[PDB]
């Protein structure tokens, strides 16, 4: 079962937010969204660029093996 870190990211709108998925690997929510495999191959960055307030919410990575849920919060500048 993949690990999805951290349990909570809080950013300001317009900032970047980068979760780590550790383990076909997908990023779900219960362009601007990118997945990057790191050199080591076990760990992937699941990044949001130019975060918007509507990005706020609950996310998982799945390999169907699902990680624990994590939360994104995008505050108002």
């Amino acid at each position, epitope marked *: 079962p993949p690990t999805f*870190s*951290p*349990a*909570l*990211l*809080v950013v*300001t709108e317009g900032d970047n937010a*980068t979760f780590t998925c550790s383990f076909v690997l997908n990023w779900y929510r219960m362009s601007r969204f990118r997945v990057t495999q790191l050199p080591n191959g076990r760990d992937f960055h699941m990044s949001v660029v130019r975060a918007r*307030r509507n990005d*706020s919410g609950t996310y998982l990575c799945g390999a169907i093996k699902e990680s624990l*849920r994590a*939360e994104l*919060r995008v*505050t*108002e*500048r």
Partner: antibody, heavy 120, light 109 residues
Framework: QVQLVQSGAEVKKPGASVKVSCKAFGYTFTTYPIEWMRQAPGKGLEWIGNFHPYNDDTKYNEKFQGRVTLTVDKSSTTVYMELSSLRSEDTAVYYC?????????????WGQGTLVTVSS | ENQLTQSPSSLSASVGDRVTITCRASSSVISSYLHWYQQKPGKAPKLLIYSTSNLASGVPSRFSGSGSGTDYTLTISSLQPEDFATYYCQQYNSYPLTFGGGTKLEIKR
């Protein structure tokens, strides 16, 4: 068994620095930001900043004007709040706190508070 | 900063009464990010209500929260002895985080 345990009461002269510890127990240290607040007798509650062990990111209240530094020791799951150039108006109980799943900004877990008295 | 102002600053009531406290934000907050704490003398605050209306763990259902935009309330609909304390609101809508000044619930006599 989530717990935040802070260091003990401190007395300081004006101009000095304090470093207050908050040691996190009972969960994966990197999963949550640690938030800092203080409560002065007649001011109520003031937010100081936060530090995320996940990525070492810090946010600060601009009111502190770069007088606060937050640092971490991952080895001992401890976040440090260092407050420099202390003034009388810095006398307060300092708290660390964290959220929990789904609290959306609400602080579920709190350290016991550290009294810092600043005075000549 | 988004200033929060609580009303009233103090109020006196009895065991069994119902009271409502108000939190007003200088700027509109998404209601997910507005919370309430109870503080008793010599203790850290304890989260009471998160996201406007959700009771925190172990909080009795005589507490309720309501609101949105800039206007929020906390109600205790049948006071118990333990309930006399200071209540604060807090916003996690924008940095810096802010808290209200507090409302102190006292015993009427």
């Amino acid at each position: 068994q989530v717990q935040l345990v802070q260091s003990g009461a401190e007395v300081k002269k004006p101009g000095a620095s304090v470093k207050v510890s908050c040691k996190a127990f009972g969960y994966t240290f990197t999963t949550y930001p640690i938030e800092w607040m203080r409560q002065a007798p007649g001011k109520g509650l003031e937010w100081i900043g936060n530090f995320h062990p996940y990525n070492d990111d810090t946010k600060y209240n601009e009111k502190f004007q770069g007088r606060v530094t937050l640092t971490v020791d991952k080895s001992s799951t401890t976040v440090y709040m260092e407050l420099s150039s202390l003034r009388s108006e810095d006398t307060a109980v300092y708290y660390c706190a964290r959220e929990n799943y789904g609290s959306h900004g609400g602080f579920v877990y709190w350290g016991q508070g550290t009294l810092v008295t600043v005075s000549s | 900063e988004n200033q929060l102002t609580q009303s009233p600053s103090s109020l006196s009531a009895s065991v069994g009464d119902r009271v409502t406290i108000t939190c007003r934000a200088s700027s509109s907050v998404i209601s997910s990010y507005l919370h309430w704490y109870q503080q008793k003398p010599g203790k850290a605050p304890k989260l009471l209500i998160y996201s406007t209306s959700n009771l925190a763990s172990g909080v009795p259902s005589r507490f309720s929260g309501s609101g949105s935009g800039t206007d929020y309330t906390l109600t205790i609909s049948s006071l118990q002895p333990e309930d006399f304390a200071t209540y604060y609101c807090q916003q996690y809508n924008s940095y810096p985080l802010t808290f209200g000044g507090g409302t102190k619930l006292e015993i009427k006599r």
